[model samples]
Target chain A: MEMDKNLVREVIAKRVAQEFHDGYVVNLGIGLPTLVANYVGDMDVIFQSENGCIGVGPAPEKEDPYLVNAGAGFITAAKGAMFFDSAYSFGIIRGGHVDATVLGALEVDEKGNLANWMIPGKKVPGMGGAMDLVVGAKKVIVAMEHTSNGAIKILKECKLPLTAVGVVDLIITEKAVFEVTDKGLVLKEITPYSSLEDIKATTAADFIIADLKK
Target chain B: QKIVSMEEAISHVKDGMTVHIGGFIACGTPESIITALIEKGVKDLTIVANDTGLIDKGIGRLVVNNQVKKVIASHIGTNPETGRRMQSGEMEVELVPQGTLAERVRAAGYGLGGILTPTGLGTIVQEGKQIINVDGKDYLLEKPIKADVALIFGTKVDELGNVICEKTTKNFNPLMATAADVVIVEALEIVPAGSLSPEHLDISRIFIDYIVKS
Candidate 1:
């Protein structure tokens, strides 16, 4: 199965939806993770925002002033949405009320470590709620491209600053799906277009491929 | 009591003074005050807020005019000027965790010595900050934040300075109102005395000093 970029993206979206259970409260981090809200069919999942929205619905109509996300960016308002102060919003994220969090990453390591915060010498614009979401959410899924500047992002050790240590539970890339295990990073499933040799050559981390299902 | 124009309200701001501006992105920011600030040509200010609005609107214009030196905010994705200035080493920005930023501002308004929260304990926000452990959990004791002046915007105001904010623009106006040394508000309409009910007042007159017609 040789999947194109669009197909690979679709597969990744489907896999993310599959990871969601009914009646779950989820937070989608900035960037690619924000796209997950467009993919989750009609499931009972409620999207929680750190900016101050919960049970948030789809994007609001244009010209509506109240239609904004927790980040104060314009977004569609979901049905039965609730808005509160930022303190109470982060309380929900830190109190373990969230089921899962989908985030974007710059790099990951063999130990499932994540580096989404700073890039060292570059302007380190601060971290939002990434630390709390990483430690508090029961499951953490990172959806990011496999490479940056043609350099492999999955590495034996992250060159960028680490946001969390051994906090990532799962990762879905254009090349493969990896599950972080106590032993090490295990490649669970390769995308239809990618081969084991191709994945190995693309990733700098040493990983064992898990048994493929289906 | 004398009524001052928007230009006079903005002239009260000075160089190197810490300023708190109302509005979440572009919702409730005082356009007249912003324009007046630009006209005043005050430079090297420290701004405290949630986000700088789009490039040409709200605080975005201030950043564009190069009047701001340091901005303490939660997110900057709405304004590219912030990122460009930060990257170019022309600006200094302290990106606070959204929740922590709100709490710090609120703590100042409420007159709390400091708050103990676990939002930004191990991240870069923790740099040069004290961390305390409560019941075996680490919490960052973030200091209360205040400003030299708070420029706020609202929908309506009474002669006594009681404000009634429109639906969505009520994001950070009330909190910043109480946290600044002098609170100046620009309202769309100014009503007669006793026109506003007590329950309708989001921020009290004790915190507000002057009212300007928008």
Candidate 2:
């Protein structure tokens, strides 16, 4: 079960990487979304770490104390990368300049509402730029597990506090890929490891099946 | 530029004062200033920053010591002590979206009334905040957040207090420099005023008040 969870994460990350386009400027939230950078291959994608660095590359073998991503993990700069302060870094986010952002979510509903920053009456970890990233990024991709220990994460309405309203564009889970469109939540693709019934049973939200993979 | 001891710089920090310490996690954090402040044992401080560092490092030290009265930051999950303090009602925390936090601080420094951003719209972050509309889109008008003193770090600082930050170490330094009444910098390397070219400086000398050797 331990090793299988890691495999599940890798599959989700690989699929999320396919969503990126050439020359896309992407911001990655911590956790599973952070792994998307590893699978980009030769595709020209610039990663922006909101802690104040752009063109973030891979993690270094030896850590540089002075360089870290938003996750506080040591990272190296990609070619042509630049660093600045919080204001400039966030300007790229709130100004609608970033092409896409991939982030983890505790709950994402059919209405495109995300509730990830805090779990009300629990420990509030804080939003950490997620609100701006989802609202301003050209595309907001949620990378998370299909369920949390058997509790449905994709819901008809979020029970937790919201990070943003109707801002999520896509959701890439271990079992399936969902897109939030004008009509409603669309089950765009189901991973080979999972069946349609598996996804239906796992998710609580109503979704329109528009599987291009079919 | 005034070259001063770390002690002299931290002396400006008084109890119950709001201080903005530059860094993302521990990177670019003015540790010398933080250490001096710790030794001085100032209490009831309100900190405005990106995150509280790990348990024993950066702003986490302040939280652990019970010096912080409140923290206005984007994230605090990095430091479990912060959550503990908050849970025990020893401290208060106001979590802001990372981008909104940066912009609010920037608005203070840049002399703006408030910034209208789509971030935090239709969420708990929007509660008790004003909502404005431009065209068909709705946005939240986040206010400015200034500080009494800003303790920032610089990779290299010239005699004129022109700061040059390397890689991701530039995180919140420049933004804090502009948003504070008193801007003190902890310099890793001090150089001749003209040694580093004008174009290479990350923070202009005009915003800096004191330079302390790190």
Candidate 3:
């Protein structure tokens, strides 16, 4: 049976959790990237929210009118969570203090190109911290579903506007794990429900399926 | 030393002015100043902010009032009116990367000429922008942004005009506090100068031109 979407998310979150190092300062983008924080339970890494919050904790049990994230949703700040101005906050990003950034992608390509900011003729609010998070973080990790409406988001080249080029170092999807490398997408692993053929059918890009016969 | 009414402070804002209003949506927004600007009925203002906020809140009310000639923001999806107007050509909208937008304001505030960022280096965001090679790596040279006037929200203002924003309410208030020709604060609490803790101060009094309680 195909994996439940929640199960897909939980599974991916588990795999992504192994990437964290203790005391790392990581930025979590909204959407699935935010889900990573929940699964990283008891880890020593600091979660940075560009709305001037560092040490972001889990979502509050209920929405508190006063406690909120940059996305305007209620959150619980971890003990010693910091609050700062835009200058200092962006400085943390642009200065490359973040060890990693996890973001959602609308489209990503073989060359690790990303396009998450806007769609033509659509009312996209604007690019939140995606660009900076992708560029300024030491490693950019993308988390998204394998596809939408039967259309492939993993492609030979991005058809939409790009947020950055060749920046994504790794990608986590329900179906597989692909690492962006100098040689293009390297399919490092696949989930139980997803086979090599399944990945090949869904991803338009050329990828290397890791040899498991060793 | 300068305490003005909403009318007197807003009088400094002219038609077709480029203005910066601080907040993430309406949480840290200066609602009273927005009300006065609406009542004053100025036309053709270009607003720079994070989001347009939901209709019936923040900049949505401005868009509803038809006072905005343009908006430069990361996103405006929160307000359907911003989309309708920008698409219909009733307003000119410039989409910027969120972190870049904040840094632009910060550079202006700090008197820096511009910022060198990798955020938009390989996307449409780099179109018509200058690129500088630092150590053989490409970086987009994004310029600083200043405003004719900046309207910022604050939870507390000392008599001497030192401003401190509270919690999520601090969002963009402290950044835009310095990135304008004339900075006006809409403070919810006014206290004796010595009552405010020095450590809690965000915007120093030197940048404030006026404080309006209403």
Candidate 4:
């Protein structure tokens, strides 16, 4: 079943890409956040993966024989790439040198709480790298669909177990954009044809609009 | 001056030993050594690696054969059989956050007591672990991880025992080499002493206990 009623995955992906900055050292989490690599706008962003490489380019030409991402997908090395073991790879992350990390979420709440790792009674693949990315990256942005099978994902509080609390800076959904603030969720943007009321209705979280940036 | 056959490599691994191996799925996996381990029917063994791998790839093959008593990894999602065994209580699974796991292993290698990080501070990943407050912020005290033997992969091993890993093949090998009591290296190619340049060599000869041809 396909779910893109108003906005497709690419639209949300591009919106997430807008968060990238030049000279930023970023780590892209698995799933939706991985697409942010394709939309980075001509920036000097150095992408680091937990597996062991920095300056990751896009997918390689025939796997490049030497480059791969954290998810073990064959990738290309950007000019002046640095490679190392996971310890050092994570030192760059936990050391707070990473400017931003984009991740996919199962649930994100008004309190800026995130639950992306596991669900009880479900097959827990275990946290691959999300916990570190959420806590260590200077800025944490979440990219996910607005809902799952019509259930509101953005909420007042996360019921599921959390990966991190109050660490999310932004949430980019296909339908709306939100900034998780100390006060609560703040509506930052809506898709071209979307409405404030529709976003409120779609989101279980409470938010105040930021005077519509035109 | 260490060159061993597959038989020699497999013979060192006894039953019920905790083994640290290096792999990220199929990339950089010591496949020939893994094949030998399976052929040896090493049972009730604990396998430490990045992931369980697919049923036919990496360490998952050993899990499939029911030789693994426990697995400590970041993820086991690639293999359903592992989940089945864990759920059935037939095998033990301890999932660590990928970055934290790597850091802990590195701590073992570097002779550090433990790692202090905020990676799992606000999540279930911090259960039963010491939490230290530095500058009013919490960090989990992740302990070092060591193993009896580490099976590592390499692209090339020169006559002097310096190892060179190419591209994506360098993920966990270099780090695992330092953390294990006995490290057995499997390189695809063997070259004469001084054949590999300093920059190209990842593991110095001191960490390699044995060299086996792939």
Candidate 5:
């Protein structure tokens, strides 16, 4: 059975939501992770944001003054949300209270190392809290496309500067999910629409389908 | 010709006085006034600013000298000493979200009753405030802010107290000057009354009361 590409991506998101149990304090990194909030409805998950917001509920109405998200960008307030100063916000991240963090990534190596902050030829603003969160969070799940500029971002070793050394726990992509093991990154699952030959051709890294579960 | 030492200028500030000191981080900070305040040993003073003084300089020195009792500021992370004291209950501090802090001070200067801004709502900032829903949006009704005295530092000032600031010198000084009961300006150069061009003046004489050359 061939699954639609959009449906594959949606299923991956749903799988990530299922990973969350009740009373989990999670930090959603910028970009795609921001959308995960829309999916986790039945679970009692509290979004602990770095930009000084906590107990977040849902987007606020347009013209709401009290709506701000972690990226310092304006957002609608979720029901029962709270906001605070960045100092206290970072304190929460640094003190190891955040149970899990979903972050965007540029590259992930065989060792589950990650790099997302800087790229050459681009003026990199200092890494804001990505490094701190990666090192501090109890669990880290990286969500990104499988490639950059047609090059496989999943690699034998990350070519770009690393945000953290061997920190990532799971990699969720549109095609598959990879779990980090001591041996290296092990392929855990593949989309029903994509074949093993197609996945191998798309990724440049040495990959092994150690656990291919539906 | 007008002339006065830095000590003489800051001597006007006394204990228990509410003072608005103008600067954003290190830019346009009144170094002379800060030193004078430390030397004056003025204690239990309320200091309003955008950021606490940098370590070994700026408003942070007042905190180091134990002169400032309460600080109403937007951010104060640059100074670790202040953070340590604040966390230990050694210092009294009120942290305001940056946008709300700027607008509240601006509202006081502009003489508007209060302007609703969406900086902190449904967060700890809303702990003791009235949350109003206007036009299907929520806002924290923050009141306008004012001070008993405004201490300003600039590049130059005319005898009549018209002031000019170079480059980034125009952060919070101009707004503080208008929002205080008495405005005291400390300048590197005090020129004749009409020496400065009207367009170059950042603050008008109507809002200023005294000028001291540092």
Candidate 6:
């Protein structure tokens, strides 16, 4: 079964939301990862924006242009939120205090390497806090599509420049969920609409199927 | 504590000087001060900022106006003009990781020689940087970054130059405040020296050199 772009992102976001628990300090990257916050129902998850605030909330009814997340999207500060400088914010991220970080990726491999910052001659947005987040977070989750316009993004090895090496812990796609471990990329679960063969056909990297699934 | 005209504030900026403009994609940027610089027609500037902002807003205007000769930032994808200039060799751009960039600024402000962290290990970010091993882990020795002048913003500024930044607008403003030779703040509201309590102040008076009330 095929899903629309919005539905595909919704499915991925819903699954990624499960990775967060109560009292967790999670940082979300732009785009797909930001949607995870909308689905983490009743969880006291504190969202950290590397642009310099923790405990970030949704956009307000009346937007305050000054108040925005790292992506420069208007957002409100949650209750008990504290605003700080970039240095201190990164300290919290690099000091190994961020519980989890979910970000979109251009490419990921069995080695847990991620490549999302730049594509060299194509586009160079530059790496924001991605390197520090992946290096210091307790868990690094890649939340993105399995392929880019039918081109496999999960590769045997990332061909593009890596954001961080051997840092990704989990990968949540619309079709399947993968856990990166010492052995290899482990296929943990699959959505009802997807199958092992479908994932195998789309993914360029080798993955070990954990158990039987629907 | 001295509130000056925009003309007086941006007078400190000159040609061929490195400057820090505080904002996360124009959210907290010193718009009035930046506009003053633009109006002054200061050219050949080395801009050290988080991002260039949108094409017609904030620091992006400087880039668009051809006032900046070089830029050192964490990301520039928000503005396609910056990419075009970089590609055409019209400007020089040095992309740094977000957290690392902030820490580099902080190191300069705090009078530190350098910092070591495992943020960009084995990536393009580490191409020309030094690597240090600590406790069996390799860390990149990123150097401090400083500027000749800094332009920052504040929601409320007291006559003593103490700043109170509101919400997400406080991203890189406070950090840039301490990393420059002469710092100017564009305040939304300016109050008497003792009107605002010390607890409400985000940046200390010690770091501020000039204030412009927008």
- At residue B81, what lDDT does model 5 achieve? 70
For model 1, residues B149-206, the per-residue Cα lDDT tens digits are: 9988878888778887654566677888989998998888888878888877766767
Best by DockQ: 2
Q: Which rank order by lDDT, best down to worst?
A: 6, 2, 4, 3, 1, 5
Give the alpha carbon lDDT tens digit for every residue of B1-214 in model 5.
3345566666668789888888655456677777777777989988888677677868888888888888887666667776767767887777665445656677798988886643344334566777778899777787888988888877888888888865445556777888888788888788889999987688898887777777
True lDDT of residue B15, candidate 2:
99
Q: Which residue pairs show collisions in model 2?
A: A129-B98
**lDDT per residue, candidate 4, B1-214, as tens digits?**
5888889878888898888889887688899999988888889998988899899988999999989999999988879998899889999999898888898888899999997888887788778999999898888999999998999988899876799888777777898999989899998999987998887789999898889998
| Stretches > 4 Å off in candidate 1 | A1-5, A70-73, A120-125, A181-183, A208-214, B1-4, B155-168, B188-205
TM-score of every candidate? 0.85, 0.96, 0.94, 0.95, 0.53, 0.97
Looking at model 2, residue A69 earns an lDDT score of 85
Q: What is the lDDT, from 0 to 100, of the residue A200 in candidate 4?
A: 74
lDDT of 3 by residue, A40-128 (tens): 77779898877777887777783654457768887778988888766677778877899989888889998989988778896366777
Off by over 4 Å in 2: A1-3
State each model's CA lDDT, in order: 0.79, 0.88, 0.84, 0.85, 0.71, 0.89
lDDT (tens digit, per residue) of candidate 2 on A89-170:
8889988899999998999998899998887667688888888889889999999988787788999999899988898999
Single out the weakest 10-residue window by summed lDDT for candidate 3 chain B. Answer: B165-174
Off by over 4 Å in 5: A1-214, B1-8
Question: What is the fnat score of candidate 3?
Answer: 0.68
Full-model lDDT, candidate 5: 0.71
Each candidate: fraction of true contacts kept?
A: 0.26, 0.92, 0.68, 0.74, 0.00, 0.87
Model 4 clash pairs are: A66-B167, A66-B168
Indicate the residue-level lDDT of A209 in model 1: 67
